[PDB]
Amino acid sequence: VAAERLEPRVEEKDGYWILKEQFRKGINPQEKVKIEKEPMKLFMENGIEELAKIPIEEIDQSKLTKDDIDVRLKWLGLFHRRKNQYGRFMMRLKLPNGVTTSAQTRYLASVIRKYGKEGCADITTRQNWQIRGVVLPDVPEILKGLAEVGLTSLQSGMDNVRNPVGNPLAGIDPEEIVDTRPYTNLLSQFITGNSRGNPAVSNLPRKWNPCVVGSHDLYEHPHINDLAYMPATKDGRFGFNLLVGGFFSAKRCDEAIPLDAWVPADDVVPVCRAILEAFRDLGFRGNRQKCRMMWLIDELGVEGFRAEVEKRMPQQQLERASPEDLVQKQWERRDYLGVHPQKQEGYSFIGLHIPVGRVQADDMDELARLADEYGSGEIRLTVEQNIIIPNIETSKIEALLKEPVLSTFSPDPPILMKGLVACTGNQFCGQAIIETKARSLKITEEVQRQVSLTKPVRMHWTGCPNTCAQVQVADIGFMGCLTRDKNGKTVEGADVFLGGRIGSDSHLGEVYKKAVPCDDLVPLVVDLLVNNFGAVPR
Ligand code: SRM
Ligand code: SF4
Ligand SMILES: [Cl-]
Ligand SMILES: [Cl-]
Ligand SMILES: [K+]
């Protein structure tokens, strides 16, 4: 690698970071959008106020404003559903560590309630909230309302740092390694500039996923993040070994690799900044399929990349990884659904199954009511698109288990439901090849009617090769496709994946059988469960 390759390609100009004039050749169309107008101005210079007044049909008549609503608004967490729900916007938060309050939950419910059949909400595979039905004229008021309740939607889509994932049992599990909330909170504060916007990290070549590990279970999936903090003691000090570059895409899925770096606990933000600056400064900005950070690591070599991180650290110091970390390899991933004692004597948490992560406004209000009546007004989201209500006096559990809503959002659903994960799919997502959420529920129900089992088999349904529902981590994964029935008619199908493992002994699954019509999946899955996962026909 020539020295010229290491010249920073972006520069700070008037508070924002822009591609240098000599580094604009051959860039992709998204990079052109960012150059044409700085997306962060919609928030930081209140550009959204005037944009929101322009009728959408007029917005669509000029490239600048059409790019504003289709692309730039993702920097404000707003995602135009152009193809499948025209004129409506999905809105995605920052929610470090998946932690929400009842007041926040009620606020989100009140927003989606306004939109009737166009509204609903979803828990995401980054333990985050998305709401649906938003119309552009309402955006300024919603942004204000989010801030009022202590929420932000900043920098949650496009070429930004995505939701910081942590341990859903942080602070409450007797077996936790380290409470991840302070660290994920710090990361989110850094990323969003304390909810004002941080232009220093908003012009990346591509999305970038961070997590902080605090569980032996590795609930945080560090193997598939761009930056994962692995808790580790080094020379008598608490800190983190760093894994880098994990990612999924249509073209390539790769597990994170060691940076060969350890930082003290207090250097979590400094090293996040250094890595992001290196990625921002040096990353490829051509073909969008080759812009994730792992491609930069492959180009420079991990040592070459490490040197770039090191030079951007305070006092330019970056220690080598500790030989061992604190995560115990002898571990069995624990079920968090149901009632579990907390480390605080006399208190329990309850994990509740949210079928395919989908809720309506009335459901959100009911969950918020439960968190207030039984817990401390806190609701935690999980990456399996479920919830935990922590801090429940154990004496209240008997009454809680009798609550009617727990028949729908159950502490003990059938085992296949416990592990079921499904992306948005074509109900709302324009890239989706198939419907996912309703279909996955129907198929899983039919499968479980036919077989019993004791192994916690994890089934993931994703609607296109973007693999937002992470089919490569699943025991059985389903990737949407179009295929053919016996008469040659077009039908929805799935490519079936096997071999995904999570926890310390992680492994990426691969396609097992292509092009299975969705209507033929039940017998295939029933047999896979009996033959490979110890299931017993009923
Ligand atoms: C909601 C969510 C799936 C879910 O049902 O839970 C989701 C939904 C979408 N993803 Fe994703 N992704 C979601 C997690 C992921 C993950 C999983 C993860 O982070 O562990 C991945 C794979 C891991 C990764 O990125 O390394 C993922 C890989 C992508 C990709 C492919 C990335 C790539 O490098 O090629 C795209 C397309 C893109 O960015 O170019 C994408 C694009 C999208 C968009 C924004 C496309 C769009 O504008 O329509 C989807 C919005 C649909 C909608 O209306 O909900 N989504 N997406 C997840 C939101 C997470 C969050 O709260 O921030
Ligand atoms: S995997 Fe595809 S269909 Fe599913 S939410 Fe992501 S982009 Fe949409
Ligand atoms: Cl996006
Ligand atoms: Cl679309
Ligand atoms: K779920």
Side-chain angles (χ1 to χ4, degrees), residues 80-83 430:
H80 184 25
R81 311 296 68 200
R82 176 170 296 276
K83 193 185 98 176

Side-chain angles (χ1 to χ4, degrees), residues 74-87:
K74 293 171 182 170
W75 272 257
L76 280 66
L78 287 152
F79 296 73
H80 184 25
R81 311 296 68 200
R82 176 170 296 276
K83 193 185 98 176
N84 300 24
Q85 200 191 18
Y86 178 83

Side-chain angles (χ1 to χ4, degrees), residues 53-220:
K53 298 176 180 175
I54 310 169
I56 197 162
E57 321 311 342
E58 189 184 335
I59 284 170
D60 279 358
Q61 292 186 243
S62 95
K63 189 191 186 290
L64 185 63
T65 50
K66 193 175 181 174
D67 284 345
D68 274 347
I69 64 161
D70 281 15
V71 185
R72 300 196 184 89
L73 268 185
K74 293 171 182 170
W75 272 257
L76 280 66
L78 287 152
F79 296 73
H80 184 25
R81 311 296 68 200
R82 176 170 296 276
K83 193 185 98 176
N84 300 24
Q85 200 191 18
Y86 178 83
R88 305 299 180 122
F89 294 77
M90 173 275 280
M91 195 174 203
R92 176 189 291 175
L93 304 183
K94 276 277 181 299
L95 203 74
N97 225 115
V99 173
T100 62
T101 70
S102 53
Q104 290 165 348
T105 303
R106 280 186 284 273
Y107 175 72
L108 297 171
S110 76
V111 175
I112 61 167
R113 179 170 287 115
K114 184 185 176 175
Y115 303 125
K117 70 181 176 190
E118 305 299 339
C120 63
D122 289 286
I123 308 166
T124 78
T125 55
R126 295 199 75 75
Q127 59 174 183
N128 197 7
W129 278 119
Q130 290 186 167
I131 59 167
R132 305 185 182 278
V134 173
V135 295
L136 188 60
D138 286 348
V139 165
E141 187 51 50
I142 294 164
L143 291 168
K144 286 188 184 81
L146 288 173
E148 194 176 25
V149 298
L151 295 168
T152 187
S153 61
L154 277 168
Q155 296 164 56
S156 64
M158 284 296 289
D159 304 343
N160 283 115
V161 184
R162 307 306 188 80
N163 198 40
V165 168
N167 181 9
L169 309 187
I172 68 182
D173 173 32
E175 310 306 326
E176 70 177 336
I177 301 166
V178 62
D179 187 344
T180 55
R181 295 170 299 168
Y183 304 110
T184 55
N185 290 165
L186 276 170
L187 290 172
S188 189
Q189 285 151 27
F190 159 64
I191 294 151
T192 67
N194 298 359
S195 306
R196 297 178 264 91
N198 184 2
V201 299
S202 65
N203 189 6
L204 311 180
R206 213 65 164 82
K207 69 180 294 185
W208 191 93
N209 292 316
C211 78
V212 182
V213 170
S215 64
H216 290 112
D217 314 73
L218 301 188
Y219 289 129
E220 312 84 354

Side-chain angles (χ1 to χ4, degrees), residues 81 92 130 132 422-426 428-434 436 461-470 479:
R81 311 296 68 200
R92 176 189 291 175
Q130 290 186 167
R132 305 185 182 278
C423 81
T424 308
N426 78 358
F428 300 109
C429 179
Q431 276 175 93
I433 299 169
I434 67 165
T436 49
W461 278 77
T462 216
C464 79
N466 288 337
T467 195
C468 302
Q470 311 152 330
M479 185 182 284

